[PDB]
Amino acid sequence: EGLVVRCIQRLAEMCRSLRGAARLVGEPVLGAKMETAATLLRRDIVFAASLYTQ
Amino acid sequence: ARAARTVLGQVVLPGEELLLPESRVRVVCGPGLRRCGDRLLVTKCGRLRHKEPGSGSGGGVYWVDSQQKRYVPVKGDHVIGIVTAKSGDIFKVDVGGSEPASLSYLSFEGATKRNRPNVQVGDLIYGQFVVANKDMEPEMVCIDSCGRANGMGVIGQDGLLFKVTLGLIRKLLAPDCEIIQEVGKLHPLEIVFGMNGRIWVKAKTIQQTLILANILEACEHMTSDQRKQIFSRLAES
Amino acid sequence: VRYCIPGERLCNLEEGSPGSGTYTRHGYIFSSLAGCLMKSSENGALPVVSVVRETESQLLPDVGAIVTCKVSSINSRFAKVHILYVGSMPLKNSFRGTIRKEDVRATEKDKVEIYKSFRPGDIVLAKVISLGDAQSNYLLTTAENELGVVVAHSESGIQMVPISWCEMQCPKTHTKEFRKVARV
Amino acid sequence: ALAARPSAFASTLCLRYPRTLDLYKTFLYSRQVEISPLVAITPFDFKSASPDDIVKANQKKAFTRE
Amino acid sequence: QWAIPVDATSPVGDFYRLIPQPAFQWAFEPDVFQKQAILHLERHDSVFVAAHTSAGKTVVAEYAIALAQKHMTRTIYTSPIKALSNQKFRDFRNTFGDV
């Protein structure tokens, strides 16, 4: 479980960039379930990162 | 001009004066009292009450207790509020006073510049104050003194929030109050009180939630014994 | 001595230069006020002729000017004030102001909590920096050692005295409070 | 272009309103009507640190960043 | 020509006579080539470096980094590997400023 988190943070970027395409076309049927997936993907272990964040 | 410790549990009126015990003492006057010279003045109607815990020391505060609806923020009170805006990096919330309060994105448990919490507009939050002086908008934090949120944060998913007067809240928040135990004997319940005049209830059935919502606002009146058992029996149905 | 009306022939462009509150046209110097004729010879000849009333009833603020003010309300991130004196002279009316959270100290630093800096009811000395937007109009600053609250006021109505650079104490009840003390 | 002399209404409209014993007796002020301070130092003469000046001169002189 | 290889000994005749004002001091001593690069870097020049030790080349890098905060500008450091990318950040975090 070292490459899973990197694959996750790679997936979340394309899901964040598909919103601009769904908005450009004008088809919010997919842009709504994609927004729900985007908010459904953000966990807390992903953002742990390093020790002295703050 | 009567004297204190003699008119305890007596209805007073604005403009009246009373004599505290003789040797000026440093007892602080409460909400409805103001200290002038070596006398006390009454500015609110109500009933005198005095609380000194267990000892012959101070041990003692003078405060009248009345019935009213308008709420003034007091430092250290548990107040339920409703979010109103999301301007900047704060969370303006309506508590019921003259001015709205102000949260911060990091005030929640484990919140940083990345893992911000989800707070929408028009949601109810359980939280405590840390600054409530009459010099700034009140500000509230929402986890703990130490930092572990003990039930605090955003609450309420399948209940009802209604409004009652400050008197019923004061009556319920008593160490010798048997209201909640008997009311919960009929209908199991869980409550989250708020010192701004708000209550969150959640029964099992929607009918029971309606009944608890209506019958809790009337418990400030209808004194127990000769009245309460018969009212409970009548509502059993 | 003689006074002026806001137009007359005074001097040529070679026989002096325009000063304050004057305008020139077609090689002549023309008056623009009704004050008194003062010709500051200074040094180097060719005096800079100007007309000044010397009785200022009102004066518009500028890009840079020292003004004495009076706080009206304070917020967690700004503090609205009321301009009361333009430097020395009393002002017949009152304008409005706003102190943003960058002009308190002379470093434009982080922290700097506005709440304990400019408590309402005080009188402060500040400097303008701009002509402002329609929300905040003058954008005063106190980023100097000589600027800040000068004459504070107690909780119960007693004239205060400075006690330190960051801390203040009540003289009567010996209560401790925070301000931004300016040099006298 | 001869200027003229005023008349009553103007000469009364342009009026400038700018001990000699005692009269109107009832309206005097006498007839009608401890503080141990332990004051601190009276000013604070700023003779001391004034942090802004510190941090500025500090960094400019120091000029090390290490 | 656009390319001048400076000789290893010819240019340098003095180091402290020039740059009258101080710089990013080092606890140890600076080598001839680090001061040689710093001398050119002061004139906002372009510098190429070919050496063997790793941190020895970083002296001029942190010279430029310390020089930026005296100019309030920003600098970009590119490291094409993740392990080395954060070590320098850690080195300069407690050392000074914000990175």
Swiss-Prot record, chain A:
Component of the SKI complex which consists of SKIC2, SKIC3 and SKIC8. Interacts with HBS1L isoform 2. This is Superkiller complex protein 2. Helicase component of the SKI complex, a multiprotein complex that assists the RNA-degrading exosome during the mRNA decay and quality-control pathways. The SKI complex catalyzes mRNA extraction from 80S ribosomal complexes in the 3'-5' direction and channels mRNA to the cytosolic exosome for degradation. SKI-mediated extraction of mRNA from stalled ribosomes allow binding of the Pelota-HBS1L complex and subsequent ribosome disassembly by ABCE1 for ribosome recycling. In the nucleus, the SKI complex associates with transcriptionally active genes in a manner dependent on PAF1 complex (PAF1C). It comes from Homo sapiens (Human). It is found in: Nucleus; Cytoplasm. It is linked to Trichohepatoenteric syndrome 2: A syndrome characterized by intrauterine growth retardation, severe diarrhea in infancy requiring total parenteral nutrition, facial dysmorphism, immunodeficiency, and hair abnormalities, mostly trichorrhexis nodosa. Hepatic involvement contributes to the poor prognosis of affected patients. It comes from the Eukaryota. Belongs to the helicase family. SKI2 subfamily.
Swiss-Prot record, chain B:
Gene3D superfamilies: 2.40.50.100, K Homology domain, type 1 (3.30.1370.10), Nucleic acid-binding proteins (2.40.50.140). Keywords: Acetylation, Cytoplasm, Disease variant, Exosome, Isopeptide bond, Neurodegeneration, Nucleus, RNA-binding, rRNA processing, Ubl conjugation. PANTHER family: EXOSOME COMPLEX COMPONENT RRP40, PNAS-3 RELATED. Component of the RNA exosome core complex (Exo-9), composed of EXOSC1, EXOSC2, EXOSC3, EXOSC4, EXOSC5, EXOSC6, EXOSC7, EXOSC8 and EXOSC9; within the complex interacts with EXOSC5 and EXOSC9. The catalytically inactive RNA exosome core complex (Exo-9) associates with the catalytic subunit EXOSC10/RRP6. Exo-9 may associate with DIS3 to form the nucleolar exosome complex, or DIS3L to form the cytoplasmic exosome complex. Exo-9 is formed by a hexameric base ring consisting of the heterodimers EXOSC4-EXOSC9, EXOSC5-EXOSC8 and EXOSC6-EXOSC7, and a cap ring consisting of EXOSC1, EXOSC2 and EXOSC3. One of its GO terms (biological process) is mRNA catabolic process. It comes from Homo sapiens. GO terms for cellular component: cytoplasm; cytoplasmic exosome (RNase complex); cytosol; euchromatin; exosome (RNase complex); nuclear exosome (RNase complex); nucleolar exosome (RNase complex); nucleolus. It comes from the Eukaryota. GO terms for molecular function: 3'-5'-RNA exonuclease activity; RNA binding. It is found in: Cytoplasm; Nucleus, Nucleolus; Nucleus. There is a cross-link at residue 113 (Glycyl lysine isopeptide (Lys-Gly) (interchain with G-Cter in SUMO2)). CDD domains: KH-I_Rrp40 (cd22526), S1_Rrp40 (cd05790). Belongs to the RRP40 family.
Swiss-Prot record, chain C:
Residues 62-143 form the S1 motif domain. One of its GO terms (molecular function) is RNA binding. Its main location: nucleus. GO terms for cellular component: cytoplasm; cytoplasmic exosome (RNase complex); cytosol; exosome (RNase complex); nuclear exosome (RNase complex); nucleolar exosome (RNase complex); nucleolus; nucleoplasm. One of its GO terms (biological process) is RNA catabolic process. Keywords: Cytoplasm, Disease variant, Exosome, Neurodegeneration, Nucleus, Phosphoprotein, RNA-binding, rRNA processing. It comes from the Eukaryota. Transmembrane segments: none annotated. Non-catalytic component of the RNA exosome complex which has 3'->5' exoribonuclease activity and participates in a multitude of cellular RNA processing and degradation events. In the nucleus, the RNA exosome complex is involved in proper maturation of stable RNA species such as rRNA, snRNA and snoRNA, in the elimination of RNA processing by-products and non-coding 'pervasive' transcripts, such as antisense RNA species and promoter-upstream transcripts (PROMPTs), and of mRNAs with processing defects, thereby limiting or excluding their export to the cytoplasm. This is Exosome complex component CSL4. The lineage of its organism: Eukaryota, Metazoa, Chordata, Craniata, Vertebrata.
UniProtKB/Swiss-Prot annotation, chain E:
ATP binds at residues 51-58. It is found in: Nucleus; Cytoplasm. It is linked to Trichohepatoenteric syndrome 2: A syndrome characterized by intrauterine growth retardation, severe diarrhea in infancy requiring total parenteral nutrition, facial dysmorphism, immunodeficiency, and hair abnormalities, mostly trichorrhexis nodosa. Hepatic involvement contributes to the poor prognosis of affected patients. Helicase component of the SKI complex, a multiprotein complex that assists the RNA-degrading exosome during the mRNA decay and quality-control pathways. The SKI complex catalyzes mRNA extraction from 80S ribosomal complexes in the 3'-5' direction and channels mRNA to the cytosolic exosome for degradation. SKI-mediated extraction of mRNA from stalled ribosomes allow binding of the Pelota-HBS1L complex and subsequent ribosome disassembly by ABCE1 for ribosome recycling. In the nucleus, the SKI complex associates with transcriptionally active genes in a manner dependent on PAF1 complex (PAF1C). Belongs to the helicase family. SKI2 subfamily. Component of the SKI complex which consists of SKIC2, SKIC3 and SKIC8. Interacts with HBS1L isoform 2. This is Superkiller complex protein 2. It comes from Homo sapiens. The gene is SKIC2. The chain holds residues 282 to 380 of 1246 of the full protein.
